[PDB]
Amino acid sequence: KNIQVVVRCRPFNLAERKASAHSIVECDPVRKEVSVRTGGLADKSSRKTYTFDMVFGASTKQIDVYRSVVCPILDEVIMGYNCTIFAYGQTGTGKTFTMEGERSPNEEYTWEEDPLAGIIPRTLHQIFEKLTDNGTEFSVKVSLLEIYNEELFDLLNPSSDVSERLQMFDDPRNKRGVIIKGLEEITVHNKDEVYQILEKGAAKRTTAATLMNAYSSRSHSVFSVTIHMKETTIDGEELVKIGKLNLVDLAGSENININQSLLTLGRVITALVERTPHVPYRESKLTRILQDSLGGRTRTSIIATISPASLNLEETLSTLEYAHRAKNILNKPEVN
Amino acid sequence: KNIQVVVRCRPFNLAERKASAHSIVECDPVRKEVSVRTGGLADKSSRKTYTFDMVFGASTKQIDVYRSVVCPILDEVIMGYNCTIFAYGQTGTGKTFTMEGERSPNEEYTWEEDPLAGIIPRTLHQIFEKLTDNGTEFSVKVSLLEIYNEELFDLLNPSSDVSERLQMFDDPRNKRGVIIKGLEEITVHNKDEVYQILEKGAAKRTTAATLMNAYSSRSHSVFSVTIHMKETTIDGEELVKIGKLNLVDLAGSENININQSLLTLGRVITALVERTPHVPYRESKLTRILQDSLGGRTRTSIIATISPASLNLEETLSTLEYAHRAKNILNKPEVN
Amino acid sequence: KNIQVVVRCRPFNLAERKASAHSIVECDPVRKEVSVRTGGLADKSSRKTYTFDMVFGASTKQIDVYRSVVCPILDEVIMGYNCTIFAYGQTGTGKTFTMEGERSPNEEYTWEEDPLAGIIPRTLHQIFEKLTDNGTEFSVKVSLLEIYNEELFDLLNPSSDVSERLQMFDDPRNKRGVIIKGLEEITVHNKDEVYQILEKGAAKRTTAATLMNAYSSRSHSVFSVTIHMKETTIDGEELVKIGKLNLVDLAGSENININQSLLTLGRVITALVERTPHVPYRESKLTRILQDSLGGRTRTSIIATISPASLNLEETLSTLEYAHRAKNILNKPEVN
Ligand SMILES: Nc1ncnc2c1ncn2[C@@H]1O[C@H](COP(=O)(O)OP(=O)(O)O)[C@@H](O)[C@H]1O
Ligand SMILES: Nc1ncnc2c1ncn2[C@@H]1O[C@H](COP(=O)(O)OP(=O)(O)O)[C@@H](O)[C@H]1O
Ligand SMILES: Nc1ncnc2c1ncn2[C@@H]1O[C@H](COP(=O)(O)OP(=O)(O)O)[C@@H](O)[C@H]1O
Ligand SMILES: CCc1cccc([C@](SCCN)(c2ccccc2)c2cccc(O)c2)c1
Ligand SMILES: CCc1cccc([C@](SCCN)(c2ccccc2)c2cccc(O)c2)c1
Ligand SMILES: CCc1cccc([C@](SCCN)(c2ccccc2)c2cccc(O)c2)c1
Ligand SMILES: [Cl-]
Ligand SMILES: [Cl-]
Ligand SMILES: [Cl-]
Ligand SMILES: [Cl-]
Ligand SMILES: [Cl-]
Ligand SMILES: [Cl-]
Ligand SMILES: [Cl-]
Ligand SMILES: [Cl-]
Ligand SMILES: [Cl-]
Ligand SMILES: [Cl-]
Ligand SMILES: [Cl-]
Ligand SMILES: [Cl-]
Ligand SMILES: [Cl-]
Ligand SMILES: [Cl-]
Ligand SMILES: [Cl-]
Ligand SMILES: [Mg+2]
Ligand SMILES: [Mg+2]
Ligand SMILES: [Mg+2]
């Protein structure tokens, strides 16, 4: 019902250690609380403390995130629901690391086994174990678009030029959802197809980053997975159940047509929590795509990412405030 | 009468080819049409198509531009009219290349013969052939100023510091024109003087680019040529006919006191085409200089430059829209 | 009474000489006038001329600045007054050079003898000569904070992370002054302590410059010196006299929450000279700190710094105009 909101804090990086950054963040997994030290040299006892559905401190690893947050959501996708997980937070804090992950250098690890892999690869792997281990007939289609400056780009298209644009339209079968005209949806026949698909997507992103200013922090990225499963009743009737999972990595929250989406996202959340009558979904590409995940029939989680350094105090607080409000968004989840 | 407007599209560059840029532009010289592919991955048949006075595709060369556009204008300068050609378009699309040209590397070519030379050098050469081949007594004076951030700089001054500023005043002999106080006008005695004059101007520009932020894309450049010719009537009377040619290379059109001129240019064109009563010439240095070329006694052409890449779709459309409106500007041309 | 305002013009630098910068500034020490050549190529005789309390031309040296401006102020600090000197001017013109100075390269000079040393080191040295040469018991405490984006940072704190923030509060003993909660005030026992203190402060600044965007030009720097002296009356009574000296190096004047202080400074000066009723001290960190120096019981001087190059004409004029107004600020100076 309420959307689930969790917080992940990344460890210090080398720049921060070189600069002797002190920590101002404290995670308590059991009480599910984050607590920010607030008063610098002036007031040593000051704190702001917030309660979330779950809390992940600096030493938390990609496997822990997946086990705690995604497994439950993945089961519900398998039972024929739509789900959305998204990452919100300041640039540099681990939205991408959490949602995609990285490759460990050289040969080192098989992609199914890279400890650095994030939610998207781990999920694609699990869909194959859980549904093959299980008998049952199924197909998996993925897609990956990016929104930048209110234009949409298709990272998995066979087209060789990233800058060729998609277009968006209302679904006549779902008052709350959209059709992306031109989107490539690639059918993923087994887990041995996965990596090449992602690698071509990554190569497409690299080109786009060289074409557009500050691409990697000003853009939103939407990875979707659609699964079709065959169910036979006890009467012997053959009916299909469809589950869809969107994995969204938002533009950096510090950025306030170039910020349109990140700004309409904020107004949308506000209009929902403060129960205002017209909710401005239409006003950005992002919120049209996410409309059903903010107040609709989709089950939603948010991963708020934060830095632990004293330097980013203000933005850290800002992310926590923003994400804590979002707990009061109520969805009405429903199978397809 | 109507001002003449033409379009030049440059070929792909190496960055674009490295990025597998697709083309979205199509020039048809005979029907005089440019046609932009408009719907990316979503709608393959979509186009916007526009008709101009002339159209130059990617494979068009500097010699072709000169033959088609300038010769006719040069004849009319020789017959004692004022003319203005200017380049309008997004940064990176060939305003400078078209108006000045480049030098081919090493020894390679004599400047009169460099295939890379643009309109200004080619014109200065022709003035000397056409008027020496012709008997007739004549003098040629040139000048070159730049407007940046509403300050005027004189690239041909003997002064060693580029940053010394010119000032502007109304001409008491021409309700539509200006005197530039302090401008150096250099007398060009033969074509063997030309290149050194341009080379010193280029060296002055190089310094200015290091002094002022983004100088080369935020500045307007005005090259003028003034020719005095001696005519004897059939009665034996000696009267002088003066022709003047301005060659303007505007700041890049993507830039929206720093954009004052490019912004007042837009309002001026608007006030003329939509027949509004007070036309705000006074409000920028550029439009004061160009006042007689926008709605006055000067004969004007505009060269709109565009990229062919899918990436620049929006600006490409924007340039074509802007330039197509300008066809409805009516001038009343007249000898001096 | 009136605040004292003086002008320092720096010599050309290598970039300017490489670019053949002409000069547009003329200092006349005896008549106390600066005079800016104003009309570029257009009008050679044009000038704007301004009178200040003192005037220092390009060839003036750090020792001259100190002798003329600081000695008098230092005597008055010793007699138990509060004084403030601050530097105002465009980035690149010598606020830091004037207020701190530089180190001559390699071994070269003892810090007490470096010809490049500015007002802060020279002053700390003199406090020790003048008060030891003199018998009399005394202690000296220094402090150094920086304001950036309305946050306060403490460069002399033992804390290893610069980004830990101070907080500000009204002094209940002085309607016109503030307490900085958390500020480290280091006791300086002899002149052999000085340099290490400054060197640690400089190392703290270096880190901050790497943490925050454009730190060195957008930040204000406040160095304070507090001196306690023991006086015995002729009756044999033991009373303490306190003198305080603030040495402020403002953010660059070309920058118009990031400009809040530099903007409220301007409004404050305006409200004083134009005698407006509510003076908006409260509205920035800087003006709260400086409140007593703008219209209060502190004795104030301003050092306006300017470039001599033709290129910076506009900002040069702007600094002179701004500083000339400030001569009409009246203070009511008083011992503690
Ligand atoms: N949880 C984490 N553990 C270790 N390193 C991390 C973590 N999160 C982020 N990083 C590192 O910080 C950098 C920024 O992460 P990134 O995902 O790009 O953040 P964002 O996309 O939010 O800007 C990357 O180099 C990443 O390795
Ligand atoms: N018509 C053309 N043919 C070949 N190269 C061109 C052409 N127009 C522009 N270029 C190249 O593109 C770059 C940008 O041209 P430039 O004239 O500087 O554009 P602008 O002044 O409009 O920014 C230059 O390197 C130039 O060689
Ligand atoms: N009076 C001066 N004499 C010689 N060099 C100077 C003088 N003032 C400034 N400079 C040089 O100019 C540069 C800028 O000085 P700086 O104090 O950093 O100016 P600001 O802090 O006003 O930006 C420094 O390299 C400094 O050496
Ligand atoms: C860009 C699509 C995507 C999504 C999720 C994970 C990956 C990557 S890391 C994404 C770049 N931030 C990937 C990296 C390099 C080449 C191919 C694939 C991926 C896949 C599997 C495991 C892993 O650790 C990383 C890529
Ligand atoms: C800057 C004045 C100007 C005008 C038109 C053409 C040129 C140049 S190229 C302008 C730089 N974008 C020129 C280039 C380098 C040195 C001297 C002259 C020029 C002159 C003749 C032929 C030619 O190909 C180029 C220069
Ligand atoms: C940053 C505090 C401070 C104040 C005034 C003067 C100095 C320096 S130069 C300040 C940097 N712009 C200083 C430079 C490097 C290392 C230690 C001290 C200083 C102290 C004494 C003499 C001198 O020439 C310079 C430092
Ligand atoms: Cl690291
Ligand atoms: Cl922690
Ligand atoms: Cl793992
Ligand atoms: Cl629609
Ligand atoms: Cl808002
Ligand atoms: Cl090329
Ligand atoms: Cl073509
Ligand atoms: Cl040729
Ligand atoms: Cl005038
Ligand atoms: Cl407008
Ligand atoms: Cl120098
Ligand atoms: Cl001088
Ligand atoms: Cl000295
Ligand atoms: Cl207070
Ligand atoms: Cl104001
Ligand atoms: Mg990212
Ligand atoms: Mg150019
Ligand atoms: Mg400085």
Q: Considering only CB atoms, which chain B residues are within 8 Å of A210?
A: 19
Distance of alpha carbon A266 from the chain centroid = 16
Distance of alpha carbon A125 from the chain centroid = 17
Phi (first) and psi of residue A233, to 5 degrees = -70, 180
d(CA C49, CA B115): 53
* Backbone φ/ψ region at A214: left (φ over 0), alpha (ψ -120 to 50), beta: left
CB of A242 closer than 8 Å to CB of A227: yes
| 3-class state of residue A33 by DSSP | strand
Way the structure was solved: X-ray
| 3-class state of residue C92 by DSSP | coil
**Partner-chain residue, chosen from B20, B39, B42, that has the shortest CB–CB distance to A161:** B20
Atom 10 in ligand 1: residue holding the nearest Cα: A94
Rg (CA), chain A: 20
CB of A9 closer than 8 Å to CB of A34: yes
Task: Kindly report the nearest CA distance between residue A91 and chain B, in angstroms.
Answer: 25
Which residue in C217, C224, C179, C216 sits closest to C197, CA to CA? C224
| Atom nearest to B97 CA in ligand 2 | 17
| CB contact (8 A) between residue C40 and residue B167 | yes
Question: What is the B71 CA–ligand 5 centroid distance (Å)?
Answer: 20
A80 CB near ligand 1 (under 6 Å): no
**Tokens at B106, concatenated:** 């090493």
B246 CB near ligand 2 (under 6 Å): no
B43 close contact with A: CB closer than 8 A: yes
The sign one gets for the Cα dihedral C326, C332, C333, C336 is negative
Question: What is the C238 CA–ligand 23 centroid distance (Å)?
Answer: 76
CB of A97 closer than 8 Å to CB of A118: yes
CB of C55 closer than 8 Å to CB of C6: yes
d(CA B208, CA A202): 41
CB of A170 closer than 8 Å to CB of A181: no
Chains that touch C (3 or more CB pairs under 8 A): A, B
DSSP state of A225: E
d(CA B20, CA B311): 11
Torsion of CA A106, A107, A109, A112, to 10 degrees: 110
**Tokens at C127, concatenated:** 């406090």
**Partner-chain residue, chosen from B160, B164, B210, that has the shortest CB–CB distance to C40:** B164
> Which segments within chain B are labelled E, that is strand?
4-9, 25-28, 33-37, 47-51, 54-56, 82-89, 138-148, 151-154, 165-170, 178-181, 186-188, 220-232, 238-249, 299-306
Upper half-sphere CA count for residue C129 (Cβ side, 13 Å): 10
Atom 19 in ligand 2: residue holding the nearest Cα: B94
Q: Kindly report the number of other CB atoms within 10 A of residue C65's CB atom.
A: 23
Question: What is the B57 CA–ligand 13 centroid distance (Å)?
Answer: 4
CB of C268 closer than 8 Å to CB of C294: yes
Whether residue C182 is annotated as binding a ligand: the answer is: no
d(CA B6, CA A162): 30
Q: Considering only CB atoms, which chain C residues are within 8 Å of B160?
A: 20, 22
Residue type for position A219: S
Pairing of the two strands C151-154 and C138-148: antiparallel
CB of A201 closer than 8 Å to CB of A156: yes
d(CA B91, CA B104): 22
**Partner-chain residue, chosen from C19, C43, C313, that has the shortest CB–CB distance to B211:** C19
Concatenate the DSSP letters of all residues of A244-288 into one string: EEEEEEPPPTT----SHHHHHHHHHHHHHHTT-SS--GGGSHHHH
- Residue C329's DSSP bridge partners are none
Q: Kindly report the number of other CB atoms within 10 A of residue C139's CB atom.
A: 14
CB of C25 closer than 8 Å to CB of C306: yes
Q: Which ligand is nearest to the CA of A93?
A: 1
**Tokens at C7, concatenated:** 């002008």
For residue A273, CA distances in Å to A48, A277, A319, A331, B313 come to 22, 11, 16, 12, 39
Q: Considering only CB atoms, which chain B residues are within 8 Å of A208?
A: none
Please give the helix or strand (H or E) that residue C7 lies within, else none: strand C4-9
Nearest residue in B to C312, CA atom: B163
| 3-class state of residue A6 by DSSP | strand
Phi (first) and psi of residue A310, to 5 degrees = -60, -35
| 3-class state of residue C25 by DSSP | strand
Residue C223, C-beta contacts closer than 8 angstroms, at least 6 positions apart: C99, C120, C142, C143, C144, C246, C247, C248, C249
Rg (CA), chain C: 20
- Residue B231's DSSP bridge partners are B239
d(CA C98, CA C303): 9
Rg (CA), chain B: 20
| 3-class state of residue C78 by DSSP | helix
Pairing of the two strands C299-306 and C4-9: parallel
C257 close contact with A: CB closer than 8 A: no
Q: Ligand 5 pocket check: which of B142, B198, B220, B224 to mutate, most ligand atoms within 8 Å of Cβ? A: B198
Please give the helix or strand (H or E) that residue B197 lies within, else none: helix B194-211
Number of structural domains chain A divides into: 1
| Atom nearest to C202 CA in ligand 6 | 1
In chain A, the N- to C-terminal Cα span, in Å, equals 17
d(CA C160, CA A22): 8
Angle at C274 between CA C268 and CA C276, to 5 degrees: 70
Q: Considering only CB atoms, which chain A residues are within 8 Å of C207?
A: 19-20
For residue C232, CA distances in Å to B42, C131, C236, C242, C286 come to 91, 15, 5, 14, 37
Q: Considering only CB atoms, which chain B residues are within 8 Å of A182?
A: 40-43
Unique residue bearing structure tokens 């003087």: B193
Please give the helix or strand (H or E) that residue C153 lies within, else none: strand C151-154
Which residue in B88, B2, B332, B296 sits closest to B177, CA to CA? B296
CB of C83 closer than 8 Å to CB of C298: yes
Unique residue bearing structure tokens 């500050």: A214
Query: The CATH number of the domain where B272 resides is what?
Result: 3.40.850.10
d(CA A180, CA A283): 16
| 3-class state of residue B1 by DSSP | coil
Residue B278, C-beta contacts closer than 8 angstroms, at least 6 positions apart: B271
Residue C181, C-beta contacts closer than 8 angstroms, at least 6 positions apart: A41, A42, A43, C166, C167, C168, C169
Length of chain C: 336
DSSP state of B117: B
CB of B27 closer than 8 Å to CB of B34: yes
Taking ligand 13, which is a single-atom ion, which protein residues have CB atoms under 5 Å away?
B 27, 57-58
d(CA A172, CA A323): 32
**Tokens at B266, concatenated:** 């837009």
For residue C86, CA distances in Å to A239, B210, C102, C125, C304 come to 80, 31, 18, 19, 8
d(CA A95, CA A304): 8
Concatenate the DSSP letters of all residues of C229-282 into one string: EEEE-TT--EEEEEEEEEEEEPPPTT----SHHHHHHHHHHHHHHTT-SS--GG
CB of A226 closer than 8 Å to CB of A184: no
CB pairs under 8 A between A and C: 48
Length of chain A: 336
Burial level of B100, CB count in 10 A (0-12/13-18/19+)? buried
Pairing of the two strands A165-170 and A151-154: antiparallel
d(CA A225, CA A144): 9
CB of A123 closer than 8 Å to CB of A247: yes
Please give the helix or strand (H or E) that residue B288 lies within, else none: helix B285-289
Torsion of CA C274, C279, C284, C288, to 10 degrees: 110
Q: Considering only CB atoms, which chain C residues are within 8 Å of B161?
A: 19-22, 310-311
Question: What is the C91 CA–ligand 24 centroid distance (Å)?
Answer: 7
The structure was resolved to a resolution in Å of 2.8
Residues A258-282, buried b or exposed e (16+ Cβ, 10 A)?
ebbbbbbbbbbbebbeeeeeebebe
Upper half-sphere CA count for residue C236 (Cβ side, 13 Å): 0
Pairing of the two strands B238-249 and B82-89: parallel
d(CA A188, CA A124): 9
Maximum pairwise Cα distance, chain B: 72
d(CA A118, CA A8): 13
CB of A79 closer than 8 Å to CB of A333: no
Question: What is the C134 CA–ligand 2 centroid distance (Å)?
Answer: 74
Concatenate the DSSP letters of all residues of A131-165 into one string: HHTT---EEEEEEEEEEETTEEEETT-SSS-TTPE
**Tokens at C137, concatenated:** 């018991």
Question: What is the B28 CA–ligand 13 centroid distance (Å)?
Answer: 7
Nearest residue in B to A167, CA atom: B42
**Partner-chain residue, chosen from C20, C42, C43, that has the shortest CB–CB distance to B161:** C20
A22 close contact with C: CB closer than 8 A: yes
Residues in the ligand 3 pocket, defined by CB under 6 Å: C 10-11, 13, 89, 91-97, 305
The sign one gets for the Cα dihedral C311, C316, C317, C318 is positive
Task: Kindly report the nearest CA distance between residue A193 and chain B, in angstroms.
Answer: 24
**Partner-chain residue, chosen from C21, C42, C309, that has the shortest CB–CB distance to B182:** C42
d(CA A162, CA A205): 8
d(CA B204, CA B148): 14
Q: Which ligand is nearest to the CA of A102?
A: 4
For residue B282, CA distances in Å to B37, B329, C336 come to 39, 18, 59
Residues in the ligand 6 pocket, defined by CB under 6 Å: C 96, 100-103, 111, 114, 116-117, 120-121, 198-199, 201-202, 205
d(CA C191, CA C123): 11
d(CA A114, CA A63): 10
d(CA A156, CA A198): 8
| 3-class state of residue C93 by DSSP | coil
For residue C327, CA distances in Å to A1, A235, C50, C289, C302 come to 67, 97, 12, 20, 9
d(CA B152, CA A280): 48
**Partner-chain residue, chosen from C39, C42, C311, that has the shortest CB–CB distance to B163:** C311
Long-range CB contacts for residues A41-48, cutoff 8 Å, separation at least 24: A41/C154, A41/C157, A41/C159, A41/C164, A41/C165, A41/C166, A41/C181, A41/C182, A41/C183, A42/C165, A42/C166, A42/C167, A42/C181, A42/C182, A43/C167, A43/C181, A43/C182, A48/A317, A48/A320
| CB contact (8 A) between residue B163 and residue C310 | yes
Unique residue bearing structure tokens 């053959």: A238
Concatenate the DSSP letters of all residues of C162-230 into one string: TTPEEEEEE-SS-TT-EEEET---EEE-STTSHHHHHHHHHHHHHHHHHHSTTHHHH-EEEEEEEEEEE
Torsion of CA C292, C293, C296, C300, to 10 degrees: 150
Q: Considering only CB atoms, which chain B residues are within 8 Å of A145?
A: none
Concatenate the DSSP letters of all residues of A35-80 into one string: EEE--TTT-TT-EEEEE-SEEE-TT--HHHHIIIIIHHHHHHHHTT
- The residue segments making up the domain with residue A278 are 1-336
Whether residue C296 is annotated as binding a ligand: the answer is: no
**Partner-chain residue, chosen from A42, A43, A311, that has the shortest CB–CB distance to C163:** A311
CB of B11 closer than 8 Å to CB of B23: no
Long-range CB contacts for residues B252-258, cutoff 8 Å, separation at least 24: B252/B89, B252/B90, B252/B91, B252/B92, B252/B95, B252/B217, B252/B218, B253/B88, B253/B89, B253/B90, B253/B315, B253/B318, B253/B319, B253/B322, B254/B90, B254/B91, B254/B315, B255/B217, B255/B218, B257/B149, B257/B150, B258/B149, B258/B218
A14 close contact with C: CB closer than 8 A: no
d(CA A86, CA B263): 41
Upper half-sphere CA count for residue A244 (Cβ side, 13 Å): 19
Which residue in B13, B3, B9, B16 sits closest to B311, CA to CA? B16
Question: What is the A29 CA–ligand 23 centroid distance (Å)?
Answer: 59
Atom 11 in ligand 5: residue holding the nearest Cα: B102
Atom 23 in ligand 6: residue holding the nearest Cα: C117
The sign one gets for the Cα dihedral A310, A314, A318, A324 is positive
Q: Considering only CB atoms, which chain C residues are within 8 Å of B165?
A: 39-42, 313
Residues B176-207, buried b or exposed e (16+ Cβ, 10 A)?
bbbebbbbbebebeebebbeeebebbeebbeb
| Atom nearest to A205 CA in ligand 4 | 1
Which residue in B44, B249, B80, C187 sits closest to A157, CA to CA? B44
Whether residue C44 is annotated as binding a ligand: the answer is: no
Q: Ligand 1 pocket check: which of A6, A10, A247 to mutate, most ligand atoms within 8 Å of Cβ? A: A10
Phi (first) and psi of residue C35, to 5 degrees = -145, 115
d(CA C268, CA C300): 15
Burial level of B210, CB count in 10 A (0-12/13-18/19+)? exposed
Unique residue bearing structure tokens 């150096």: B184
Residues B64-77, buried b or exposed e (16+ Cβ, 10 A)?
ebbeebbeebbebb
Which residue in B53, B62, B83, B69 sits closest to B335, CA to CA? B83
For residue A31, CA distances in Å to A54, A68, C67, C229 come to 9, 15, 65, 56
Residue C271, C-beta contacts closer than 8 angstroms, at least 6 positions apart: C278, C279, C280
d(CA C99, CA B255): 39
CB of C300 closer than 8 Å to CB of C320: no
